[PDB]
Symmetry: D2
Subunit: 466 residues, 4 copies
């Protein structure tokens, strides 16, 4: 609550300790669902692919390459100009844009247009307009989507993917330029060593013998459940465009092209093994809450609506903790004072005999651990659950005590003169006045986790209002 600067200055200057100890008055007194972990700020997370793409952007930028957007939709006449005869085997792995003619009848009519199968198809077009018109060397990059049909599968390969590519245009170029660029780039993503082998594919658009495959060594990978056990993985490729191809676009200068698969680099930088689970987690049921998250989701259902009632609840737990061993039958006044224009007396009791006030589980605490919600007691048997899971800070009596106080509160509204609520055996969270949204309940089942809140609460509260 707010307070008075002057009053506190004038009292603190005379009796500082008083003022200080009094500061407590300005703090908010919280009802159960307003207490950490039940309260929390949140923040947006970012997807591993896009994190990687942005990193890659900064990687190429820092080594002097400039950003560019190449043509994505291209007349397949360009694959023919770039591959020669091999051209027809490349277009078999491509997609053609088809449209709908000018109702329920209509059917897609293919066209000549394609969706680039790789950044190269467009580098040519883009380079043709500026290779002889810009100061040399020209260093450009583009990280963007491409398409390539893959044996009609999502498992053998996704249909779309990102390629982080670049091009170096200079008068004098050797394969040592791709190597120099491959290293200056990967070394920023943590790789420490590199090996370059010649690609047996020897593609028509690359000067023969320049098409190199690049292997990098990454620490994170060493001793990994994968095959990249030794830390080495093929992470990129490159070459020097053929003059035959450059001609078809009238490019007079030699051009080094080095590109890389973004999906794979993300899998490495963020620890994934299944490309599809990495980019499409939701769709592949790869969702997950943390114990912390689930604990925050366990809420108290019935809660006293009066400052008086909160006290009443406090008192029932207060006096239940003390006299939790008084053999039955007994009774104690937990709270007496007035609420809602009338005096009230609330008592903790046990009617049955040959036992004690509170059952042997009244003090059990609800704690989340490795995905399940347990209703357990702080025993040297549940040490791990309490030291590793996250304790909700609610015990059976706590949940009950709030139930009770809400009841006696409702009574003193319905004018009634007496109300006595009692808890017997606990089968589930409901019996402890504790709930969780229907979505969290489904996440838990979907995830094959359990709710295990059971026990002998046997706690009774008698109230008499006037």
């Amino acid at each position: 609550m707010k307070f008075d600067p002057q009053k506190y200055r004038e009292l603190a200057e005379k009796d500082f300790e008083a003022a200080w100890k009094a500061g407590k008055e300005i703090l908010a007194e919280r009802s159960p669902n307003e207490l950490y972990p039940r309260v929390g700020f949140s923040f947006g997370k970012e997807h591993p692919l896009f994190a990687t793409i942005q990193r890659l952007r900064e990687a190429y930028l820092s080594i002097g390459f400039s950003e560019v957007v190449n043509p994505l939709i291209v007349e397949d006449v360009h694959v023919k100009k770039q591959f020669g005869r091999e051209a027809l085997a490349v277009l078999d792995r491509c997609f053609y844009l088809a449209t709908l003619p000018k109702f329920k009848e209509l059917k897609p009519i293919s066209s000549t247009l394609t969706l680039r199968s790789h950044m190269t198809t467009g580098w040519f077009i883009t380079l043709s307009h500026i290779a002889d018109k810009l100061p040399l060397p020209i260093k450009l990059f583009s990280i963007d989507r491409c398409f390539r049909r893959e044996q009609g599968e999502d498992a053998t390969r996704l249909y779309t993917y990102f390629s982080a590519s670049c091009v170096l245009v200079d008068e004098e170029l050797s394969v040592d330029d791709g190597k120099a660029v491959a290293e200056a780039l990967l070394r920023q993503f943590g790789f420490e060593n590199f090996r370059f082998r010649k690609d047996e594919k020897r593609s028509k658009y690359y000067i023969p013998d320049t098409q190199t495959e690049v292997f990098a060594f990454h620490p994170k990978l060493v001793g990994s459940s994968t095959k990249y056990s030794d830390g080495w993985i093929e992470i990129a490729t490159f070459g020097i465009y053929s003059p035959t191809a450059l001609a078809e676009y009238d490019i007079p200068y030699p051009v080094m092209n080095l590109g890389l698969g973004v999906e794979r680099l993300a899998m490495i930088l963020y620890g994934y093994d299944d490309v599809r689970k990495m980019v499409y987690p939701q769709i592949h049921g790869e969702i997950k809450l943390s114990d912390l998250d689930i604990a925050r989701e366990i809420k108290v259902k019935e809660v006293p609506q009066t400052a008086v009632g909160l006290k009443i609840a406090q008192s029932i737990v207060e006096t239940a903790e003390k006299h939790a061993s008084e053999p039955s039958p007994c009774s104690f006044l937990a709270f007496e004072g007035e609420m809602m224009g009338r005096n009230v007396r609330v008592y903790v009791v046990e009617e049955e005999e040959n036992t004690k006030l509170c059952g042997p589980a009244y003090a059990n605490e609800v704690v989340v651990y490795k995905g399940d919600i347990y209703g357990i007691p702080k025993t040297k048997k549940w040490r791990s659950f309490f030291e590793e899971g996250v304790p909700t800070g609610i015990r059976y009596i706590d949940g009950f005590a709030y139930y009770a106080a809400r009841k006696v509160e409702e009574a003193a509204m319905r004018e009634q003169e007496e109300v006595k609520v009692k808890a017997r055996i606990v089968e589930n969270l409901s019996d402890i006045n504790l709930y969780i949204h229907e979505n969290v309940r489904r996440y838990i089942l979907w995830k094959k986790g359990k709710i295990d809140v059971r026990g002998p609460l046997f706690v009774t509260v008698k109230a008499e209002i006037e």
Copy 2:
């Protein structure tokens, strides 16, 4: 050059002042083409589309939304499940993927479509989580979409970027959309918002929730465009219709807001034509600055010898003061030895009535607004000299280097005497300067001009002993 600390330590515990002035001996002596601005670092420049995308990724994150990647390639049955009746239409604006049959031709269409808007992918994505994650759910995604519009590029482009988000919760209203729109747009500097109901009342959104958002950005008022009052339509949103949602087993309202990246990036980076902003190479937008072109203007022939330079420096020297003398006359500029052969360097003129040096000997090469000029440093030209970039190379300079190098060629061939002249400058070559074919080919393309002319009329004589 490297030095010795003790030397300087003691060499100055004695007399500081001289030790200090001595330091200059450690500085590199630069030959003409190793001098600013002919030397410089460069760096990557990013593209405005992508910068904007990134700015949006951050803008969505700072307001709670987590990033997701939505299905791009989709069976057209999804568009049918989401639009219902009007679906027949909607599909005429999408593309379908076709493929070449494995002959033992013509591409054979399939039932797969490229998403025309992000919504097609959102329902799919949400069906796996909307019932198992704590509410609210706030997801977003800036990604590519494909749309055929008539079949023109001035109308719109085939591919574009959508920056959109979904907001799953138990109780939503058109107000949640407005709130989000503001939180996101305020971060790009928009100051005021106005919402209006979008007439097209699409069937995928609850009736009357589809809203069009207008925003006032200060950059825009005064705009050489029609956003002159500063307002512009920049986004749209709606709450999905349970008709569509129910098709995916999503049991809660879902707000969907989205905004076109291209329009935003054009506002932010100041572009008027989308295709010029996105594909500036393909649309002739290449652009070197003045400082960049100056950087490219180099001295063609330079003296390799240490004395080769001390020479041209003198040729340029004496001919600077005695440039005015009348013809004929001749001053001795240099004398010493190179390639182990003592020589004498002379600045001269033979003809009569004229003078030693033409009147353009001290004209400096300077770049301004894309053109390379060769002009004298007169008040008539201050603007060019003070807002353009002066190459630092004058007509004599360009020359004195060609001279001092031609004598170095005399000594190499045992020869005994050589005399190279200089009269009328019709260009850069004539002044011993060049620019690489690509920058020349650039200056042409950008319809720019080189104007290096003038009366140099300065001759050099030297004979190697």
Copy 3:
């Protein structure tokens, strides 16, 4: 509210239009304080200094310099080693660290320790440990705080400040290296042209004649209320460290040092003219809300707590708009239905005669504009206010109507049989059932802005419950 996937699928497949038009049921019906602009998400803004420092970090990184932290607290023996005799005039502008000896007695005892007056004092120390031990050239930078007492002022200069400095260590160096580096850096912050003049200060730690001052041309500045009218401003300096100084630390190689004032570059990149107002806005009363922000802060005080009551309020405005011209006296039933276990009749009226039901301002709307809150009517006289300020979307009758409905709601609780609330003349927001937090009210006064909500509302509501 949530809904049923199956029920909606099975009805939409048969009668799509029905389902669709029915979708409206799942939308939340909002009470007045839950309507935009009264609702809004927010986000953290960043300070111009730190934005700039981070930009500068990326600027040096992209041009191949590496990050370093230099010594900030230094034995003044280092100024003596670096400046020679000029050393004592440099330490007069410095701060010495003083401590408190080992109560109320105690007094600070100076020491030999200083707080670097510039990044240079520390570059020497840092460079001594690695100039001969690392591959050449060495490119390092550091953007960090420095101190320099300035004639006992905050106006003539702040005592602390950031310096974004760097060093180039190579065997061969000329002043053309500082120029090349000054440009590759500034060109990233938008400057397009540069001029370098020799600094008359000719400082002892720089090889004579190398200490260059750097002037850059920036567009943003052209035609500016400043002196940088022409777009040129001195933005950095540089030099080549003296061998005399390098020796004192045993540095054998030549070193180029170029640094820059971060505060000034921020002022340019974010449009400020007073350094102190830029870094310490709060302290200099430079705070500010937007009309949008203030509009969001105008809340409705008394609000119906029953779905029934919201309707009642809706009806009073409903029937007040229609019959707002019926000469007095008159009366109309606005709403009749039951609320809280009893039937209720609410009427709009005017008891006085020779006028009409509603006053001539009942429809005035509260709109924020250029900082003041106005209670005005959509007249071709207030076009600008409505087209430029931000309309709250609340008019006198709206605020009142909610008051009323809350009253009749309270009545039907106190069992009462009749209640009649009436609005006469409006002097302020209070009279329209509209408030603003005490802080926003103070911001408005502090900012010298006004609240101008006046007018003849004269609206009456009679209710009769049973």
Copy 4:
């Protein structure tokens, strides 16, 4: 090299296959020191402290807090207004600023102090806004603080970075602090939190609000440190006491959370000693990789002529197969002309019983774990060859270049015959290789070794006609 498109266009409309194989003529022919890894780009690496600061600036922004700059230099009366009684103490840990009096000496202290914690600056900053801005107010600041601790650097450092925030509102509790702590720490990968009351109950926070926050980070379990169970104290917070607040006319509770950057950055980047993480130069942490040192191993003398190379390539060639032949013997490696003078190049050996080439002629120079080795490619060495970086230069190579260049020196001096030998390699020089003084001085400093040894025993004979 540049080429002609028509040439290749037609030159292949005829026979593609050959036009393709022809392209290789456009590739640059690289001399030894222009080959990978002797060539490479480099780039700036950022410092872990500053990266962490930046990561925190983002972390605070994504949770609502706006950035502010707080007063650093402050009159000690503020510490007195905020701590009250215990203020006497608190000031003994701060520094005071002293200055030299303008003689017509010793520094004269003033009453100004460098802030030891961020709180000293927060009250000042908040007094101007806590009553005039809409609540809540959420501010933060990652900046420098000064603190004397005993007078040791192993204990703590004099300066450090504080990442802190304030949260002004009408109703706060210890819960707001925990919530914020989680929102901020979760973004650095901490998964579980435990809060405990800080015993020191400082007077600037309401009694019993001062909390110590412990967080579980997965990197930390297994930790070669004592955070082995993964938990660590990483931040602290409290709600200010109105005793302090009232001194500034702030009428609302204020939550203050703060966390040390240095500890966080050490966790994130894996450092055990703060001063080694912050000042790695001053504490000998310089570190070149293997690939970086390989890059620095260069061929000292290289043949300038085009044929100068075609030569050494052959010297290296024939001596590769016929390396095994017994002594004496002699093979003709090259014959053609350079500097316009036909010559013959021979690989030979005179002595007896031995062989042409020593047995270490094919030893490759490779870098591994900081040391430069000269070893043969045997299974005994795979680990070195497969995890280190092979310079690509073998003993003969290093040599054949020295040879082919010594004959180029024979032709330059009109001479007619020269013969250079090669026996026992005691090092890098002996194999015609060098590393710059700085990398050598580095390898020493990092107590690393160079091991270039072996029986080369290979001699070259050639006579220029």
